[PDB]
């Protein structure tokens, strides 16, 4: 589909900004610290994200923010558009099944 | 008695310092049928004792193709065996696609070892309860590799795994020097004799229950069944 092609050159970069930042942090740790630090942080993130609200309810992700160092950092991401005020919410069961990988 | 708590899981260490799930996977592979794998200075032969669920049901195949120069002998869980065979086939295809050369047997065995080690360390996964005798030919010559449900692997000149394989192992250890320097037909006959030693005295080898896989210098891995194994059975001495 044409949706795969980014509309803006900056869109692809800022859409995955958090993922790219985590990847860069893992790359730096792994360059300097070693394989243990990225693996440790990956398990920690997986553990914190595994426990949260269901997809149709907005989660706080406080522990994830603390682990990622964003608990005291605010960017345009947090303010410009609120995940709480989604304006678009699907069927609860449908969203849960989508997250589970069934769909 | 006191090991019930540490027996259920694979990520739980026993007070003696031994994971019991791996040993139970070894028991599972032991519970399977018997295979014999031996190699001469120029050939590697895998002879397996196929088992039939019933008289009407056909004997289930135990020799599986992997590459033009690599083959395996099945022993233990069938689903894990098929998964491992698919993984090895994909690895060999990737090697021949990238480097345009056959994948060395030792590298494939190391990859299998790592792959089967991964589950034993993680939660929610069980060890691959399958043992494989891998026969292949490389620049170093014939190879016989024994893969255990525990990720550790062994390099052998002759080995038998499965049920009642102790007699076959004893016979193989009796004539190792004969195995190393002998003709291809002699090597196949030695493997058949070991497999017979596994069998009860009353029973005897038949074309239906014998599967032979041979890989050599100029010979690719070919699996012989029934009328194809009849020539090898002919001329075999009486037990």
């Amino acid at each position: 589909k044409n949706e795969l092609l980014p509309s803006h050159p900056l869109e692809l970069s800022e859409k995955n900004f958090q993922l790219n930042q985590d990847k860069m942090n893992f790359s730096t740790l792994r360059n300097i610290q070693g394989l243990f630090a990225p693996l440790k942080l990956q398990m920690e993130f997986k553990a914190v994200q595994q426990v949260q609200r269901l997809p149709f309810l907005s989660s706080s992700n406080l522990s994830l923010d603390v682990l990622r160092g964003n608990d005291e950092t605010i960017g345009f991401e947090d303010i410009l558009n609120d995940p709480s005020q989604s304006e678009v919410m699907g069927e609860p069961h449908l969203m849960v099944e989508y997250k589970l990988g069934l769909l | 008695m006191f090991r019930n708590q540490y027996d259920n899981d694979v990520t739980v260490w026993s007070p003696q310092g031994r994971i019991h799930q791996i040993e139970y996977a070894m028991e599972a592979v032991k519970q399977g049928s018997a295979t014999v794998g031996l190699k001469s200075k120029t050939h590697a032969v895998l002879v397996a004792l196929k088992r039939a669920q019933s008289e009407l049901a056909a004997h289930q195949k135990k020799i599986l193709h992997v590459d033009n120069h690599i083959g395996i002998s099945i022993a233990g869980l069938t689903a894990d065996a098929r998964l491992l065979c698919n993984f090895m086939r994909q690895e060999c295809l990737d090697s021949r696609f990238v480097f345009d050369r056959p994948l060395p047997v030792s590298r494939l065995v190391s990859l299998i070892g790592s792959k089967t080690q991964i589950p034993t360390q993680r939660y929610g996964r069980r060890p691959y309860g399958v043992g494989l005798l891998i026969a292949g030919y490389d620049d170093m010559g014939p190879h016989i590799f024994q893969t255990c449900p525990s990720a550790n692997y062994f390099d052998c000149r002759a080995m038998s795994i499965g049920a009642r394989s102790q007699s076959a192992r004893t016979y193989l250890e009796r004539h190792m020097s004969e195995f190393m320097e002998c003709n291809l037909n002699e090597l196949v006959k030695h493997g058949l004799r070991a497999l017979r030693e596994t069998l009860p005295a009353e029973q005897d080898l038949t074309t239906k229950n014998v599967s032979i896989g041979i890989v050599g210098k100029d010979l690719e891995f070919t699996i012989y069944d029934d009328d194809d194994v009849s020539p090898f059975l002919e001329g075999l001495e009486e037990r």
Partner: protein, 273 residues
Amino acid sequence: MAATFFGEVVKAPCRAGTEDEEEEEETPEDREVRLQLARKREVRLLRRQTKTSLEVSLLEKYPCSKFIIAIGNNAVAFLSSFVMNSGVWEEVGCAKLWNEWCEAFCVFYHLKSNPSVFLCQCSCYVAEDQQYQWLEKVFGSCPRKNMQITILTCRHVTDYKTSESTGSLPSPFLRALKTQNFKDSACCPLLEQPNIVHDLPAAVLSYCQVWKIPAILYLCYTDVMKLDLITVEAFKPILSTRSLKGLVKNIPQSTEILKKLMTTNEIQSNIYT
């Protein structure tokens, strides 16, 4: 011990089985279904010949002097191969029971020449709550204290406990366990101290010991259990000794051929080839 989700609280299972009782410890419907299950599980001893339910115990009805009991497919196969063709054995009685875990039958035989000698080919499993009921149905409450009971069963090498590992152990080995009254030679090494038997052979042997009945229990530990010829070959020493010396005639030839018949007609493991 569920661990269905992340925060699921799991509880360590108790080897003593306390948790089952703790959960257990009413509603008329629950009591009714429990009684239905109880009468579904109870052993019903009867004979297919003439369809006459055997309310009276076998021991009370006929006086037995030698009761050979075989539990497990290999043991009943050995008996079928060696003792049937030696003489004549007609069916008298058959216990019928239903278990959660499971040619599953418990058939009793008696020699026409000497009715005092009986037999039991228990190819089916009996739950922990039904061995005592089976003993009540067969032996009744009043024993004879004059019966030579030779219990035959097959076990797995993994069950046997010793310093040597299971693999290193010679797989086709068998042990013996005899009561105080049984003064005859066991012909086999006695079971190791830590080893324990906890099935129908154990129930029968305990019944014999409590009531002073001479009995001997044979346990043939083997790595394979599905109609294996090596198991019966290792059982042969049992008939080589007394008790089963006269029951089986001097015709090993037919038995050896007969033993092959049972092994040929066997079902292999689809999961493990």
